[PDB]
Design a binder for this molecule. Structure first.
Ligand code: ZN
Ligand code: ZN
Ligand code: ZN
Length: 62
């Protein structure tokens, strides 16, 4: 059976973990290519992504 996802609490989407919901990179990255203050490499300014644990379902199966 399904359980509501403990990581997002059912939201499915979550705040982007890279920019923390601000939309821009917070650091110059170790790769040398993502710059602090540029558009977030992961969410491209949308400020959210899908939850990694449930892939956006909000629930986990049995
Ligand atoms: Zn989730
Ligand atoms: Zn959301
Ligand atoms: Zn982001």
């Amino acid at each position: 059976n399904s359980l509501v996802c403990a990581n997002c609490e059912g939201e499915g989407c979550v705040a982007c973990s890279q920019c923390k919901g601000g939309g821009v990179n917070l650091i110059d990255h170790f790769n040398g290519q993502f710059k602090a203050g540029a558009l977030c490499w992961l969410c491209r300014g949308k400020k959210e992504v899908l939850c990694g644990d449930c892939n956006g379902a909000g629930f986990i199966g049995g």
